[PDB]
Write a protein that binds this ligand. Structure first.
Ligand SMILES: [Cl-]
Ligand SMILES: [Cl-]
Ligand SMILES: [Cl-]
Ligand SMILES: [Cl-]
Ligand SMILES: [K+]
Ligand SMILES: [K+]
Ligand SMILES: [K+]
Ligand SMILES: [K+]
Ligand code: NA
Ligand code: NA
Ligand code: NA
Ligand code: NA
Lengths: 336, 352, 352, 336
């Protein structure tokens, strides 16, 4: 495997990432009688087991399958949300969110603005599996966040662990803006840790510094956080370099202030993501940090990303911005 | 079903040319008394006055557009009957979704002339804050969801709203208006199918006024989705009313969708002939009403033109409910810019 | 059409339950001699051997998947008849578009076992260069367009190809296979409507094996689009063949689309009973063929496993026809990286 | 108006931008018997008159209307191209390209890669009106190029004039990769100039330096080129600053080398576009230039873009990155 998963709110119990999603969903339906969950295949628990037992607990009118039509799922979701009911839609793989692109970008994101706040779909959240999975190839691997980041009016949120997932998903569900929640599917069974049983929230648009450091700032999100955490340990051991490791968490609106504050301290920045380099969200972080931190930057900002290709099947080990690719770029940046 | 032992392709001939439901002929006479809705005088006059007030507004705003006083306009000519007729069959709180030809629904619901005008002018009275193109109307108070330019996107949204209404145990319907063109979009297929499989109390109201479809119009698609369907004469307000009224009653009771396809291309003429036959109108009333309507519209028009546009700060609000700190930074950047460069911008035409 | 003077909603009852065309009963007997295709012995045996060779391959690759030797697999169980039966009715050069259950079409077209296996293993013999997930087959030589994961995207593409074939004055058809689920996608509505309004020589082949639709399956949608439609028994290779054969002849002559909905859930059993009744097979032949098939598949399987994967450089080609200088820079970056860090990568399992 | 339009291949004649498109299209159908043009409303000349007379000249089987369905138009186009025939699809406004997003990004862009070059849709070009127009508001104004720039396998091309349009459109039509050609609709009637009657090509992935300069490098595309051309003149007159003005032309794959060569010379860069700042293509240019030119950059790179909002109706004069906004940012950058 290319990563290793590692690491106050009442009683907790061991949950993997898919279980933490179920727990968020369950807490949500318990609290909010309007809330419904729907998608292609959610009734009997879903492909990744994220909705197991919810239909039996809450009823077939609240946890139900739609026809196989992503554009419809999102339009339908918008519609529910227009009435003020909580609509939690699932798109089975992030790769299949594109048929819904018009409903998300032209409709959901602009609903409140274009009406003068006479109507909104703030109570919509779209959750979807995301990211590489070892053998997903072109259409079961994709990381579409950069496409959505260029759309004012939506939020895009990506967690790194079961604890982070449940808190961030609850915040999306309760946030008064349409939210896309991308669940890193490679962690569904892999990452396991103590998760509060009862509801809690983690704030949106707030990065998390998971490790303080002084020579360089490392930024990623989802699974890639675990990669840069390892890269930090590699850098300490092999180079004597102290790395500050940051999980962005919310892609838009993003926490410009946390990232810039870190870079003022360290003077160097490397951003990593699985998505292709060109047009990827690392460009927006790099360009912003450069504007705000120009007098502190001792070296060019590094982007260690996927190549500008579709996501391959057999070649995945060579495609992904793994710990060695990140480490080598970090080394070169430190030597600058 | 059963087996068949000879090979036979099903032709598009299956049931028929779907016939067009009519109540009133072109001389305003009821064709079959069993189908007369016997609507009261005051509501029939309200149908007539709504249609003609819309037509007066259309004349004036169309000319305003030709002069460049507003940037864009879409008239309602020939659709006045479908919209008033159907609107009259709804409950006040039934939620409406539409596109560009639905202003008559608003007009029937007593949307003020001042607010039609405010939206078209993007002025300070516009509750849409001047942000959309003209005729992209919306009214929360009158349960008329804000129109958006992309065709057919409202169709699956209307279905979601209807599913939510079913759950809320509402005695509420949703109506969703669209044209035959919009019915070609994928979102139309989504809406129709979702409404049927999810059992939603929704009326799909398709305006049909060769390159768009090859079957028998849009009504012939309904059965294939398991949707109860009818075709009506869109120049006949009573045919429209009757079909909408029965669709609404069944949709709400049975949680099932209905499709009405209204054939259009005059509705106003036909309704006027009806009024005369009852002794409910005459030439003096027609003359006084044309004068009063024109005065009402011109007063709204002149007022709307003279209002300032909204504060340019409204450019930034409602993007999200709250305003992200980075968006506020952009708003602050604009304000600093206008302090230095304001003489190059039309500040005097905008509020504050 | 005409006018109607009473209000009547058209029910989804219109024509019927569409009946299921059958030729051969479950004991392999022809039900109606006028419908016997009288296919020659050698082609019927080819139908049978193709179906059973696919089934043998399926057994072995399904187990390979369960062991983690390939990452993913989709079997053909129960669809063997629909695919071989329809494929036999096409001309060799008719272009095929599909999804996941169409491997029998390839098999009928003599696609090598080595190449099915190469794609599933992503090995050096794969003309797809190891880039897609298993069972995403394609063959230019055999006019089988490369399968992609997104559902129903092939439907409007198939229509475009058919429009192009019409222009080229081809005597060529296009067939487009999809499931009842995929028919819910907007792209399905696009395809069907475009094929009708643009008059394209295409066969839509819908596999139907409550939450998906409410009308009478997919065949009941055809008439509403102006598409000639039929429902067939998908366990009956001769019913499928006959329907595909006639659809192809008419589609090509008339430049019009046809929809076949094949009802599925054994086709192999039924065909085997037919062979016995003609004196065309027996238990000794069945035993020898099962042994030979298994040996052919196992030889391909073992060879496919032992082949190296392609050169990792193939990660970068065919993104565009040419390779952009900036993409070549990324390829060069990879090569520099493997020079230094290669011990951490499976270089020995990949070519060069 | 917010811009002013200004400024070897045989006989030319005066053409505005819509006429130059017609001329490209006409030359294309004349040369290539497979080529067809289709869309919602192209048969009788289209909303912006770009296909006038083509159906009469080439036949109703080659210039025809489809049903009103953007996802279908692009899928259908792909299909034609799979057979090797030239398919020139029109999407009526760029704002309405989003329903086709799945067919463009998941299908068109990946067609060649995913098949090992057994099949392709290289002979597809999608042309669409683009950019602000004074009163288009949210859905007749949009600049969607940054959404497409994050998709390996497609080209995205935007011209600044009638001469540039015809040459770039012909290159797209003949290029062996699916291309999106965005036509700046505010120029359809406004910009007029001599255009060769006979076919010619302008290369893709090549920027054009339209004015040499030594103190600062200014990059834009479409209409915005004319804005930065004026800003250059403002800077010369008011500040004594020499501006190098570059039209990017091809958004992806973009001409990294021309932009970097200019910035090595000048040491400063300002990029401008109508699209919203966040996730906009200026981020990718800024982040790249910073990586390649770090030792030469004397100041932080400026991005003068649309705000992160939907495109407003009444507020358009305040929204757009006009000459004053560009000029002020340039001034501040020069004073850095
Ligand atoms: Cl007037
Ligand atoms: Cl006044
Ligand atoms: Cl086995
Ligand atoms: Cl071997
Ligand atoms: K939300
Ligand atoms: K709409
Ligand atoms: K597909
Ligand atoms: K091309
Ligand atoms: Na419409
Ligand atoms: Na219409
Ligand atoms: Na399918
Ligand atoms: Na199926």
């Amino acid at each position: 495997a290319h990563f290793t998963f590692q690491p106050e709110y009442g009683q907790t119990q061991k949950m993997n990432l898919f279980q933490s999603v179920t727990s968020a969903l369950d807490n949500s339906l318990a609290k909010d009688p309007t809330a419904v969950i729907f998608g292609e295949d959610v009734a009997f628990g879903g492909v990744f087991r994220c909705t197991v037992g919810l239909r039996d607990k809450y009823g077939k009118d609240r946890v139900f399958n739609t026809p196989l039509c992503e554009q419809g799922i999102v339009g339908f979701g918008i519609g529910i949300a227009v009435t003020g009911a909580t609509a939690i839609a699932e798109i089975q793989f992030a790769d299949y969110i594109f048929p819904a692109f018009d409903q998300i970008v032209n409709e959901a994101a602009k609903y409140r603005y274009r009406s003068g706040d006479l109507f909104n779909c703030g109570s919509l959240t779209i959750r979807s599996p995301w990211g590489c999975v070892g053998h997903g190839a072109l259409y079961h691997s994709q990381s579409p966040e950069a496409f959505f980041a260029h759309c004012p009016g939506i939020k895009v949120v990506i967690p790194r662990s079961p604890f982070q997932a449940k808190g961030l998903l609850l915040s999306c569900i309760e946030d008064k803006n349409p939210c896309i929640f991308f669940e890193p599917k490679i962690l569904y069974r892999a990452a396991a840790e103590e998760v509060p049983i009862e509801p809690y929230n983690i704030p949106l648009s707030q990065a998390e510094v998971i490790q303080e450091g002084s020579d360089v700032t490392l930024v990623a999100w989802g699974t890639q956080v675990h990669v840069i955490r390892e890269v930090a340990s590699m850098a300490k051991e092999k180079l004597g370099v102290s790395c500050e490791v940051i999980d962005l968490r919310t892609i838009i609106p993003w926490d410009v202030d946390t990232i810039c504050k870190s870079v003022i301290k360290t003077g160097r920045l490397l951003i990593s993501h699985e998505a292709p380099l060109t047009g990827g969200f690392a460009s927006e972080i790099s360009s912003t940090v450069q504007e705000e931190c120009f007098l502190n930057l001792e070296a060019p900002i590094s982007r260690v990303c996927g190549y500008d290709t579709p996501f391959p099947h057999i070649f995945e080990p060579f495609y992904i911005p793994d710990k060695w690719k990140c480490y080598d770029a970090l080394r070169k940046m430190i030597n600058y | 079903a059963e087996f068949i032992d000879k090979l036979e392709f099903i032709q598009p001939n299956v049931i028929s040319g779907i016939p067009i439901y009519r109540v009133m002929d072109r001389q305003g006479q009821i064709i079959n008394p069993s189908e007369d809705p016997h609507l009261p005088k005051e509501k029939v006059l309200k149908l007539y006055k709504s249609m003609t007030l819309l037509n007066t507004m259309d004349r004036i705003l169309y000319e305003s557009q030709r002069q460049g006083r507003i940037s864009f306009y879409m008239t309602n000519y020939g659709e006045e009957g479908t919209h008033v007729g159907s609107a009259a069959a709804l409950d006040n709180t039934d939620l409406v979704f539409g596109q560009y030809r639905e202003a008559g629904v608003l007009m029937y619901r007593d949307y003020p002339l001042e607010l039609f005008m405010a939206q078209c002018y993007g002025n300070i009275s516009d509750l849409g804050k001047g942000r959309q193109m003209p005729v992209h109307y919306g009214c929360k108070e009158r349960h008329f969801v804000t129109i958006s330019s992309p065709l057919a996107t409202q169709i699956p949204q209307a279905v979601g709203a209807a599913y939510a209404a079913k759950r809320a145990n509402a005695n509420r319907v949703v109506i969703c208006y669209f044209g035959e063109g919009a019915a070609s979009e994928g979102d139309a297929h989504a809406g129709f199918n979702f409404a049927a499989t999810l059992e939603c109390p929704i009326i799909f109201f398709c305006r049909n006024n060769s390159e768009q479809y090859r079957g028998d119009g849009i009504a012939a698609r309904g059965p294939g989705y398991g949707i109860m369907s009818i075709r009506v004469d869109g120049n006949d307000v009573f045919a429209v009313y009757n079909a909408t009224k029965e669709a609404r009653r069944r949709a709400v009771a049975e949680n099932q969708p209905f499709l009405i396809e209204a054939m259009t291309y005059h509705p106003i003429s036909r309704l006027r002939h009806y009024l005369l036959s009852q002794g409910w109108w005459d030439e003096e009333q027609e003359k006084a009403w044309r004068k009063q309507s024109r005065r009402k519209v011109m007063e709204a028009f002149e007022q709307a033109e003279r209002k300032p546009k909204p504060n340019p700060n409204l450019l930034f609000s409602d993007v999200y409910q709250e305003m992200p700190a980075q968006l506020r930074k952009q708003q602050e950047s604009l304000a600093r810019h206008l302090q230095t460069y304001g003489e190059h911008y039309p500040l005097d035409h905008f509020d504050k």
